[PDB]
Ligand binder design. Structure first.
Ligand SMILES: [Mg+2]
Ligand SMILES: [Mg+2]
Lengths: 295, 101, 132, 338, 196, 559
RNA sequence: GGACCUGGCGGUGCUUCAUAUCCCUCUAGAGGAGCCUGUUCUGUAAUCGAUAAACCCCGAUCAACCUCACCACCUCUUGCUCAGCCUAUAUACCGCCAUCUUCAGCAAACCCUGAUGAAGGCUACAAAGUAAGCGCAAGUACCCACGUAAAGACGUUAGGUCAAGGUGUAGCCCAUGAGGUGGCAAGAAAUGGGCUACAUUUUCUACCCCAGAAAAACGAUAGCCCUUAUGAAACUUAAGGGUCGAAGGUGGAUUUAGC
């Protein structure tokens, strides 16, 4: 009951005061974040599931000592959901009498909001009622109500820097498979690209890698308008070429217009390729190749 | 009071090999060279052959120290795969955990 | 089906502690290791000796405290110090508990040539995490 | 060896073989605890450890390590063996149950009071009796022939409040629990005349089961079907006659008995209905008129019709018994007290 | 009557108590001693993490309750007597090389177990910049050629690793002797050195 | 030392001692197993080697009749086999060192033919007239100063005072010179040998000291410690020369130790008034010891503090007790507190004096600091604390003390419960204090119900029941008071007149006639003279009905 | 015998389907050759277990001696063990798993319906179901939120393992136990899986991707010889070298794996 919760609250306050004393912190300004940091330090647990780690922190009962429930819709068994439906229906009645990057929350979010359990059909009914509310030319008083149930669904660009020589430049980095590259692109240049201090046509004898390097500058029509110095390590020739391409595109984003940045993002020049080698599993030849199925 | 007579035999072999380790090392070092005369190497060969059979370190078998299993024994823990799996699954072994990646 | 270190639900009546209720694939995630020593780390030696000593300590404390250990032991090694932390029931009299603590500590210290200590945490009954 | 040893529970699980191919579908040994009679600090060497197996202080002084003599150790071993034998004998023997209608039948067997209610409700005054335990089988594709137990349970407080219920379960004890916990929520209240008998004769036909109950004076006993005897004991009826004819289905019998007993009309209800004094005439009391009921409202001055011949549907068996033509060799047989 | 368990002493504890006195040294977590209402364990559905009483998960943790920041500060205040001030005349590494050209590296290993022995601790490494030695062209060339791979031309550092002897002190003495004999032989001149 | 767990935390002092004894018994059993089966513990895996964790050896292994086996037995103290081997060696006539025979005599005299007590297989004189030590001494080929020294010391230790005198005479015949310890043993033997008056003993002690000076033998702390121990037998006369001995110590430069001051204090602790003479010694001793770290020098050092505090408790000097405690809590001096019994007695006396004299605030501070951290209080100490709290009118902590009593194994102490109940029920108090006292009384009643004296029909004190009922009435729990009125005749315990008055006072507020009449029933049952007056009050302050007044008239006729 | 209840299995159609999946379509394979390896058979005096999916480079992340449990011969008897047994039984079990599972159901505990019969409990503009718990899910590991792992209940095959170990039952106790020396293991043959290839998108060399040659040679890790490594022991292991240059010329029905 509420007595047990109040006893737990008092115990938590006393323990918080003891923790503040132990850590030497001020017992007044000893907030929840301080409590969590102190507990993590004093009881260091490396269990991956954060819910299983030690924690010091602060459902209820729907009727008093006389047995009378607090909510008039308690006997429905879903008092929160039906109260919400009743309020929405009342708002719809009021609207009828008087006359994007947002989506509806999922059933789990609705259950968390209403601390109850709801079926799929109940969720669909509530969503349809909310949609009818939205389509009814609802005012701000109901638009805020809708936004209570609404859930929201650009690439950051590095700034230009200056070097000892006086040139204006930007620097970025990228990776592909097991290769990591860091690129420096100058605002003014002559198309020279040097990888690890070596000219690109010598470090990349394969024409495909050179085409991959050309792709970012060619896309925004800036061949020969910049000078690039890249340091790449790991992977093979194609992985290094892809990493250098991604790093060069990310760095060149600092010099092209925002529209060109969006165009490059739509062209895939900025997304990091998550395709990496899949681990071999026991009982099979490769990542997916099973052994020859005998009969 | 070892697990089985095979573990008892292995214990006897280990003790005898440890007892005769230095003599075997010296005689074999006499043998394993191209400097000393061949006749001395031959008498060293017959000497090392005269040593008891169970003193040869090759006869030592790495059995599990708790079930005497001859095969499937991890050298670091000296345990068979079944016993090691049991202890690790119960969590009694520090650090060892299920591998997922 | 995987039968290793798992408790199978039959009627929702069998009480299980936190350790028993979790399958092995939860060791790194929900239940830390019952023993803590540096032997299993990288570049460290004597892992097998520590394992054998831990097994003997568990089998010895289980029989020295018959029907008293509420849950599995916790073995900690710090330098040459060994600490056995045991959750024990309150069935036995404190005189017998202290006698067993002294006896076990002295015998283990003389047997393993290390300063063994034994810390007992008493509980009224076996703590039930859930029923299966 | 030593590291190959296991725990007692694991060894018992391995030895008893509670699970396996044989025990999976039914295609003798039992667990015995070896720690019930064993005391810490007791060994075959007979050592006395101060503070563990012997008192730490003797004569107000700290005891030292002592070893029992060979004769003393023999005495201790004999005492241990005697205790083990006595415990084994006690476990082997049992308090014999009270058999029901027959030695191997489940009917009439008491189950004790029903389980207490959650909201501070106790039924310690209620007695629970089994009336039928049937094994019922069904044809399912997944499992072939599925087996279950249906149990008919009657409960009663011996003061009129009694009920019956049906429990279906895979386990017999679960069926007993379900039925006896459900019965107390279905309690009829049976009105008893003078707290020992029914108010009047009850002739009923529930489905294909005819029940004929005759009101009887004090001391007549329960001359009724054994199930009816049990149900009447649960209700609180001590004197009644009951004949069952046609189908003797136990469930139909119980349902019809409860229906008839609940539908019976009390003397007070009759007096209120017809507005006349209900007066009892007893042969043992001579011509003395005993007014057992009086109307609650105004009395009716109509002297009622003096019916020359009552148009009542008689029963042939009753008339035959009254006229003596009945000569059944089983009627009025001497029987144990009921 | 059966024995009654006393209430935990955390109830008698004060908010402004001296915690380091409660846990002076490393010790397992004791619910009767820790006043914090800490909870550990993965909660069951519609449940909460298990309380500290009988919590084996808390017992497993190598807690730092004996090493609170106040306790750390008090311990360091006590231990400041044992320390010795670093020489302020060589605050930078350049002065360190100017005054101490030879650096000795030795590794000490700490691990759980009854035996403290570890062979890996017998290794000694001697590092010295040849530019910090008194050598001429011929001596420097001869010493570099003699040491071979032990000298890195990029860093101008001679590195001698000694582990031949069982002990740390023996390996250190061997490294010093090796450096001395290498220096003296490098300054020495031999007949075969002419036919280059 | 105890396990930090609520179940295993000792409650009382007896529990503390029993738990420590059980732990020591377990350690001894483990060591007995280790020594009985050493082959299971010979495997060494400790680096560096730990000698104290290896099995020990007590039985000799040399079997030949020679000096080696005899020396092995002597160093293993196996007195029986050492004597048998020495007899065999003497029969064979083989060589034996003089030092070896001296060591044999030392072992025999120190142990007195007592085999050392391994793990397993007071009043009077412990020495025996016939022994192998005397025989070997007679058969000893050559004697030396150390031989006489050790024989005298062993005979004094075993109370062979006449034999010690004979050894002294033999030393004088040999014209050898003893040492300081031998002279101290001789002084002890001379003092304890005969029941002579003080004059002869003091003259003999002075003559022995002068003889020691003549023998070029220098004194030591043991000399003055034994002198004071001997002079303790003659307090009246020895009160004067104690200061002379102390000044002799100061002049020589032999700084008196804790045991020396303890012996001086004991000598000044003559049965009678201590203020007359101990006031001249205790303050000077404290001034000398003030701010001085000590080291173990004499066997009686550990006693000092205890004895001091005891006489401190006699002097009722809170400042002196504080000085003594500060001396104890100075550097390492706390280690001189002594054994468990001495520590318990010292802390009991100290806390009793604090409760008697110190202000109740500092008294409670000391109560928190010492109990249970230093010792578990006795029931008498808790009674004194309750008295001090009652004097300081701070009754609000009285239930808490009772809780502390339940924490310290004083739940079953009848006297403590009686004192608590009497203090609680003696005076009326505000409603919160009264209800707290009623809660404490209910807890005490539950304790009475749960006492282990239930083997015999419990003799519930009448005063306890009266006080519990009074507390229940004054708080407002009248139903339990009525039930206790019934239990009074159930337990045949006479009620209290004040209890009846409080019964009427409590029933007047609620205006309950029948509850008032029931008290008259009880009083008439016990035929107390108050009943008449009680009846009057029932007829006066209560709206008595007809049948209740009929009952009053019937009880008026019956009483 | 009457009426019901629960019933199912049917190489029985129709409409939807399957996403590396049922077929076709995609790629690379197996089925042709050699070699390697396992199995079956033959043989031996000379293990056992595994046996369609779910056995067949399986127990074994491994057999020259040991390992070893096999055979022959010899030896020992309270035996390393308060004995021992790799002796029988996985159809007595624990233990650890296969399998559907590349599944989402299993479900106690209640409530209601059928007159309180074997039973049944579905309607969302809702008409008696609720359900703890288990599993899925979720959470966690790895590089994300994806993916892969891990997980994957109850049941199914009296599924596998008494030879990991423990143990029930039964048996041996001068032997069915223990120890030593020596020894098998081959090919008429079939079969599974793997490796190398049958080449010109190749081979050799340099290089590690702008070359020069080779091209009826391509092709053995096989055979023979020799050396070396390990070991006490190499004939039987591995590595290297020399020598030999064979079968083979893209392979039938069928069949494996991959989003
Ligand atoms: Mg019968
Ligand atoms: Mg064969």
């Amino acid at each position: 009951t509420e007595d047990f919760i109040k006893k737990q609250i008092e115990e938590f306050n006393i323990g918080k005061r003891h923790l503040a004393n132990m850590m030497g912190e001020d017992p007044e300004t000893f907030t929840q974040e301080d409590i969590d940091r102190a507990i993590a330090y004093l009881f260091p647990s490396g269990l991956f599931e954060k819910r299983a780690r030690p924690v010091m922190k602060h459902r209820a009962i729907q009727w008093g000592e006389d047995g009378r429930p607090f909510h008039y819709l308690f006997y429905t068994g879903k008092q929160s959901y039906y109260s919400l439906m009743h309020d929405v229906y009342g708002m719809l009645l009021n609207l009828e009498k008087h006359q994007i990057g947002s989506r509806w929350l999922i059933k789990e979010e609705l259950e968390e909001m209403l601390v109850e359990k709801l079926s799929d059909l109940d969720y669909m009914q509530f969503i349809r009622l909310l949609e009818k509310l939205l389509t009814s030319q609802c005012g701000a008083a109901e638009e805020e109500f809708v936004q209570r149930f609404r859930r929201s669904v650009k690439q950051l660009i590095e700034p230009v820097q200056y070097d000892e020589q006086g040139m204006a430049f930007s620097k970025s980095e990228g990776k592909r498979k097991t290769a990591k590259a860091e690129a420096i692109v100058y605002k003014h240049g002559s198309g020279r690209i040097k990888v690890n201090g070596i000219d690109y046509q010598l470090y990349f004898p394969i024409t495909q890698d050179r085409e991959q390097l050309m792709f970012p500058f060619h896309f925004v029509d800036r061949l020969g308008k910049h000078d690039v110095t890249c340091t790449v390590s790991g992977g093979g020739r194609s992985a290094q070429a892809g990493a250098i391409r991604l790093a060069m595109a990310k760095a060149l984003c600092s010099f092209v217009t925002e529209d060109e940045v969006e165009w490059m993002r739509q062209a895939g020049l900025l997304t990091t390729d998550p395709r990496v080698r899949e681990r071999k599993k026991p009982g099979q030849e490769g990542a997916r190749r099973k052994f020859t199925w005998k009969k | 009071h070892y697990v089985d007579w095979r573990m008892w035999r292995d214990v006897k072999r280990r003790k005898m090999a440890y007892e005769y380790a230095d003599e075997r090392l010296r005689i074999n070092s006499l043998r394993k060279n191209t400097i000393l005369p061949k006749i001395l190497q031959d008498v060293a060969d017959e000497e090392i052959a005269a040593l008891p059979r169970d003193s040869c370190p090759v006869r030592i078998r790495n059995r599990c120290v708790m079930t005497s299993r001859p095969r499937g024994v991890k050298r670091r823990w000296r345990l068979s795969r079944i016993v090691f799996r049991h202890l690790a699954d119960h969590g009694q072994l520090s650090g060892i955990q299920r591998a997922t990646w | 089906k995987n039968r290793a270190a798992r408790v199978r639900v039959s009627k929702g009546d069998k009480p299980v502690t936190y350790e028993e209720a979790h399958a092995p694939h939860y060791i790194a995630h929900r239940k830390g290791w019952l023993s803590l020593h540096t032997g299993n780390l990288d570049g460290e030696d004597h892992a097998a000796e520590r394992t054998v000593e831990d097994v003997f300590l568990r089998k010895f404390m289980w029989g020295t405290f018959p029907g008293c250990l509420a849950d599995q032991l916790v073995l900690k090694r710090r330098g040459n110090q060994l600490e056995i932390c045991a959750v024990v029931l309150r069935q036995l009299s404190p005189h017998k508990y202290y006698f067993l603590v002294g006896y076990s500590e002295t015998l283990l210290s003389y047997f393993y040539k290390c300063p063994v200590r034994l810390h007992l945490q008493t509980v009224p009954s076996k703590v039930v995490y859930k029923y299966l | 060896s030593f590291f190959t040893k296991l725990t007692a529970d694991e060894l018992w699980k391995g030895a008893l073989a509670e699970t396996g191919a044989g025990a999976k579908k039914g295609r003798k040994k039992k667990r015995k605890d070896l720690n019930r009679g064993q005391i810490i600090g007791e060994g075959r060497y007979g050592f006395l450890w101060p503070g563990l197996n012997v008192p730490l202080m003797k004569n107000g002084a700290v005891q030292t390590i002592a070893q029992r003599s060979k004769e003393e150790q023999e005495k201790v071993e004999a005492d241990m063996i005697q205790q083990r034998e006595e415990w084994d004998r006690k476990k082997k023997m049992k308090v014999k149950r009270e058999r029901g209608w027959s030695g191997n039948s489940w009917g009439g067997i008491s189950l004790g009071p029903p389980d207490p209610g959650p909201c501070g409700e106790t039924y310690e005054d209620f007695d629970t009796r089994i009336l039928e335990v049937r094994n019922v089988f069904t044809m399912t594709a997944k499992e072939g022939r599925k087996k279950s137990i249906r149990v008919l349970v009657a409960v009663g407080n011996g003061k009129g409040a009694a009920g019956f219920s049906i429990g279906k379960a895979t386990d017999r004890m679960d069926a007993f629990r379900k039925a006896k916990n459900r019965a107390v929520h279905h309690l009829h209240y049976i009105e008893r005349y003078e707290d020992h008998t029914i108010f009047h004769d009850i002739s009923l036909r529930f489905k294909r089961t005819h029940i004929k109950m005759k009101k009887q004076p004090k001391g007549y006993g329960l001359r009724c079907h054994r199930a009816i005897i049990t149900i009447c004991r649960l209700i609180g009826i001590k004197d009644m006659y009951a004949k069952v004819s046609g189908s003797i289905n136990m469930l139909s019998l119980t349902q019809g008995l409860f229906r008839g007993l609940s539908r019976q009309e009390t003397h007070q209800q009759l007096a209120d209905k017809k507005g006349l004094h209900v007066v009892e005439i007893r042969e043992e009391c001579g011509p003395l008129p005993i007014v057992v009921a009086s109307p609650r409202g105004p009395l009716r001055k109509d002297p009622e019709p003096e019916d020359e011949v009552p148009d009542v549907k008689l029963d042939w068996e009753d008339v035959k018994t009254a006229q003596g033509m009945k000569r059944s060799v089983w009627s009025n047989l001497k029987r144990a007290a009921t | 009557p059966r024995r009654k368990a006393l209430p935990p002493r955390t109830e008698k504890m004060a908010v402004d108590q001296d915690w380091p006195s409660v846990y002076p040294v490393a010790a397992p977590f004791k619910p009767s001693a820790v006043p914090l209402p800490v909870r550990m364990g993965y909660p069951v559905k519609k449940g909460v993490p298990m309380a500290k009483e009988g919590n084996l998960e808390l017992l497993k943790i190598p807690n730092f309750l004996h090493l609170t920041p106040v306790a750390i500060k008090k311990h360091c205040e006590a231990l400041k007597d044992f320390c010795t001030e670093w020489p302020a005349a060589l605050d930078s590494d350049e002065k360190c090389e100017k005054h101490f050209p030879i650096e000795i590296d030795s590794t000490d290993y700490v691990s759980s177990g009854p035996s403290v022995r570890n062979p890996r601790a017998r290794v000694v490494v001697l590092r010295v910049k040849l530019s910090s030695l008194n050598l001429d062209d011929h001596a420097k060339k001869k010493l570099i050629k003699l040491v071979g791979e032990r000298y890195c031309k990029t860093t101008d550092v001679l590195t001698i690793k000694t582990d031949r002897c069982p002990l740390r002190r023996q390996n250190y003495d061997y490294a010093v002797y090796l450096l001395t004999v290498l220096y003296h032989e490098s300054w020495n001149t031999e007949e075969w050195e002419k036919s280059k | 030392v105890f396990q930090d767990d609520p179940y295993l935390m000792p409650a009382s002092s007896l529990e503390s001692r029993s738990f420590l004894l059980a732990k020591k018994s377990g350690e001894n059993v483990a060591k007995f197993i280790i020594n009985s089966y050493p082959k299971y513990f010979q495997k060494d895996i400790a680096e560096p080697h730990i000698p104290c964790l290896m099995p020990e050896y007590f039985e000799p292994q040399i079997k030949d009749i020679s000096e080696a086996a005899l020396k092995e037995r002597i160093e293993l103290r196996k007195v029986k086999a050492s004597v048998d081997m020495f007899d065999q060696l003497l029969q064979a006539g083989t060589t034996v060192s003089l030092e070896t025979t001296n060591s044999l005599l030392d072992l025999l005299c120190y142990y007195g033919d007592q085999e050392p007590s391994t793990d397993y297989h007071q009043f009077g004189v412990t020495w025996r007239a016939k022994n192998n030590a005397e025989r070997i001494f007679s058969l000893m080929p050559e004697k030396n100063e150390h031989s006489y020294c050790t024989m005298i010391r062993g005979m004094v230790k075993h109370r062979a005072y006449e034999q010690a005198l004979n050894l002294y005479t033999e030393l004088l015949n040999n014209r050898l010179h003893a040492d300081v310890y031998t002279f101290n043993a001789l002084i002890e033997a001379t003092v304890c040998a005969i029941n002579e008056k003080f004059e002869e003993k003091w003259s003999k002690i002075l003559e022995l000291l002068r003889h020691m000076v003549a023998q070029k033998v220098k004194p030591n702390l043991q000399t003055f410690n034994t002198i004071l121990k001997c002079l303790r037998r003659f307090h009246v006369f020895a009160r004067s020369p104690a200061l002379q001995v102390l000044r002799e110590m100061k002049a020589i430069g032999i700084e008196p130790s804790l045991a020396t001051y303890h012996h001086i204090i004991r000598l000044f602790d003559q049965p009678g008034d201590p203020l007359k003479r101990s006031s001249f010694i205790i303050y000077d001793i404290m001034n000398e010891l003030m701010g001085k770290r000590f080291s173990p020098k004499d066997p009686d050092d550990d006693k000092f503090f205890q004895s001091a505090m005891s006489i401190c408790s006699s002097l009722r000097d809170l400042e002196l007790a504080y000085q003594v405690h500060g001396l104890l809590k100075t550097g390492d001096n706390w280690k001189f507190i002594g054994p468990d019994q001495h520590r318990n007695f010292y802390y009991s006396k100290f806390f009793d004096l604090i409760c008697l004299m110190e202000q109740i605030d500092v008294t409670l501070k000391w109560y928190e600091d010492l109990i249970p951290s230093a010792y578990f209080p006795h029931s008498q100490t808790m009674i004194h604390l309750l008295q001090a709290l009652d004097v300081a009118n701070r009754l609000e902590v009285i239930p808490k003390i009772w809780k502390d009593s339940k924490e310290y194994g004083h739940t079953f102490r009848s006297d403590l419960r009686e004192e608590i109940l009497m203090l609680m029920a003696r005076d009326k108090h505000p409603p919160e204090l009264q209800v707290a006292f009623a809660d404490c009384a209910a807890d005490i009643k539950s304790a009475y119900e749960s006492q282990p004296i239930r083997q015999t029909a419990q003799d519930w004190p009448a005063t306890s029941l009266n006080c519990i009922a009074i507390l229940f009435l004054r708080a407002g729990r009248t139903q339990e008071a009525w039930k206790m009125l019934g239990l009074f005749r159930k337990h045949n315990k006479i009620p209290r007149s004040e209890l009846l008055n409080e019964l009427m006072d409590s029933a007047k507020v609620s205006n309950s006639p029948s509850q008032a009449i029931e008290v008259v029933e009880l009083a008439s049952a016990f035929s107390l003279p108050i009943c008449e007056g009680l009846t009057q009050r029932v007829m006066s302050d209560f709206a008595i009905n007809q049948e209740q007044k009929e009952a009053l008239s019937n009880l008026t006729a019956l009483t």
